Amino acid sequence: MIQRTPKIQVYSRHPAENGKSNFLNCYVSGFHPSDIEVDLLKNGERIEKVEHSDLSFSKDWSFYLLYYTEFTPTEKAEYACRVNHVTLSQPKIVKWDRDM
């Protein structure tokens, strides 16, 4: 058996084919086993519609999730990524930095 803690990155991107739109991303990488819970939060509340959830795995057994959705942020709300996994004794909450 092997278990590996997920790396968690939270960042924003504009797709080049539609640059006025902005997307909040959570890249959860390198984890094992694949069982996992991942949500985007706004002011601490789950974002219910997340348009994209893409899972893959590498040669060593090691899973990768890109979890993302269109959003329109502004100086007001706080956004974060919440992850729970067997390797994490508490849910990990990673805040979105608006410069990322």
Numbering used by the authors: 0 to 99
List sentences from the manuscript:
A recent case of systemic amyloidosis involves the highly unstable D76N mutation of beta-2 microglobulin (β2m). The D76N mutant is strongly amyloidogenic and, in contrast to the wt protein, aggregates efficiently and abundantly without seeding and under native conditions. Indeed, the 76 position is located in a solvent exposed loop between β-strands E and F. A detailed analysis of the interaction energies of the ensembles reveals that D76 is at the center of a network of stabilizing electrostatic interactions that are lost in the D76N mutant.
To strengthen this hypothesis, four mutations were inserted at position 76: D76A, D76E, D76H, and D76K. While D76K resulted too unstable to be purified, the other three variants were structurally and biophysically characterized. The crystal structures of D76A, D76E, and D76H were determined to high resolution. Analogously to the structure of D76N2, these structures do not show any major conformational change compared to wt β2m. However, although the backbone of the EF loop is well superimposable between the structures of wt β2m and the mutants, changing the residue in position 76 alters the H-bond network within the loop, in particular in D76A and D76E. In keeping with this observation, the D76A structure where Ala76 side chain cannot establish any H-bond with neighboring residues, displays an electron density for the EF loop poorer than those of all other structures indicating an increased disorder. The side chain of Arg97 presents different conformations, and the strength of its interactions with the EF loop and to Trp95 varies in different mutants; residue Met99 interacts with Ser11 or with Arg12. Such observations suggest a role for residue 76 in determining the interactions within the EF loop and with β2m C-terminal region. Similarly to the D76N mutant, all three mutants display a decreased stability and increased aggregation propensity, confirming the key role played by position 76 in determining β2m biophysical properties. A saturation site mutagenesis (D76 to E, H, and A) allowed us to show here how position 76 is indeed crucial in the β2m fold, any mutation at this position results in a notable decrease in thermal stability and a remarkable increase in aggregation propensity as observed for D76N. Intriguingly, the crystal structures suggest that D76 is an important node in a network of H-bond within the EF loop.
